[PDB]
């Protein structure tokens, strides 16, 4: 038994975790459960956006984070740095930028740190940002040449990608991200009103179809007159 109010899910607001929230949500046997001594839902602890990341990088300058779009190859210094934006291509699980000279073009790999820094410089503000949790049981320091670090980072990225009638009621009786199916919904902070049959079926609540398209209230005006 729980003392909290019993409610129904009226909206599902998809979004994306912030690094702060993942650390805040995390409780760490801590995932009888050592955290609640219970009924236990499961306590958290602490690849699909590569195309989106590439598009964002092409659509914005990669030095000042100011909107330029993909075809543009110059910052158009309006506030700007004037650097010529590279042509970004997706190779494996990495992004490679190429600069054309003013004679093969210069090429280098845009480090994930560089991409993150630029994204943080870019001007949903609450639920899903471009810059942006271990499932619970129920579900460089020294030396390290650049080659070794790059190989380790590639292996870690590859591993991450791979990892990712019993009642009288029934007796008598006898367009939303969730409805379509989710990554896109989280990126755009899509709000699902849960007005469709699919959403209610997923959440296990009475659907607004047939006997559920209305509400049965209780009237006291008739009750007093019935005695």
Partner 1 sequence: MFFIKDLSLNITLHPSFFGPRMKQYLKTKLLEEVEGSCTGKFGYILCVLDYDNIDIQRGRILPTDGSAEFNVKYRAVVFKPFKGEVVDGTVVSCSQHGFEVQVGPMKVFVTKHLMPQDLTFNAGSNPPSYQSSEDVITIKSRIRVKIEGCISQVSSIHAIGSIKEDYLGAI
Partner 2 sequence: AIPKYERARILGTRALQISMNAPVFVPLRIAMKELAEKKIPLVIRRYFEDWSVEE
Partner 3 sequence: GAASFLKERLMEASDAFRVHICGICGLMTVIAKLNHNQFECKGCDNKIDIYQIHIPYAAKLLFQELMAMNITPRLYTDRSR
Residues in the annotated binding site? 33, 36, 40, 43, 61, 64, 75, 81
212 is an interface residue for partner 1 by CB under 8 A: yes
Q: What span, in angstroms and rounded, lies between the C-alpha atoms of 165 and 186?
A: 38
Closest contact distance (angstroms) between CB of 36 and partner 1 is 15
214 interacts with partner 2 by CB under 8 A: yes
Cβ-Cβ contacts under 8 Å for 176 (sequence gap 6 or more): 192, 193, 194, 195, 196, 198, 199
Q: What end-to-end distance do the CA atoms of the chain give, in Å?
A: 37
Q: Is residue 210 a contact residue for partner 2 (CB under 8 A)?
A: yes
Give the one residue of 143, 172, 181, 204 binding partner 2; rule: CB under 8 A: 172
Contact with partner 1 (CB under 8 A): which of 1, 4, 32, 126?
A: 4
Q: 97-103 long-range CB contacts below 8 Å, 24 or more apart? A: 97/62, 100/73
Instruction: Name the residues that contact partner 3, by CB under 8 A.
Output: 1-17, 21, 24-25, 27, 35-39, 41-44, 127, 132-136, 138-139, 164-167, 169-170, 173-174, 182-183, 185-186, 191, 193, 201-212
51 is a site residue for partner 2 (CB under 8 A): no
What is the distance between the alpha carbons of residues 219 and 182, in angstroms, rounded to a whole number? Answer: 43
């Amino acid at each position: 038994y729980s003392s909290a109010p019993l409610r129904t899910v009226k909206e599902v607001q998809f979004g994306l975790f912030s690094p702060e929230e993942v650390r805040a949500i995390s409780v760490a046997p801590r995932l009888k459960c050592q955290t609640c001594q219970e009924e236990c839902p499961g306590h958290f602890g602490h690849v699909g956006f590569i195309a989106k990341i590439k598009k964002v990088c092409e659509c914005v300058c990669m030095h000042c984070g100011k909107l330029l779009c993909k075809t543009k190859m110059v910052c158009e210094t309006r506030g700007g740095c004037g650097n010529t934006q590279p042509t970004i291509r997706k190779d494996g699980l990495k992004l490679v930028g190429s600069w054309k000279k003013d004679d093969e073009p210069e090429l280098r790999v845009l480090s994930t740190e560089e991409i993150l820094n630029i994204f943080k410089h870019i001007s949903n503000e609450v639920f899903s940002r471009p810059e942006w949790p271990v499932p619970p049981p129920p579900v460089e320091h020294n030396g390290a040449p650049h080659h070794a670090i790059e190989e380790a980072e590639s292996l870690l990225q590859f591993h991450v990608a791979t990892y990712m009638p019993q009642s009288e009621e029934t007796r008598a009786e006898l367009t939303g991200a969730l409805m379509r199916c989710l990554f896109e919904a989280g990126a755009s902070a899509e709000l699902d009103d849960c007005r469709g049959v699919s959403e209610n079926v997923i959440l296990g609540q009475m659907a607004p179809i047939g006997t559920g398209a209305f509400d049965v209230m209780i009237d006291e005006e008739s009750l007093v007159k019935y005695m």
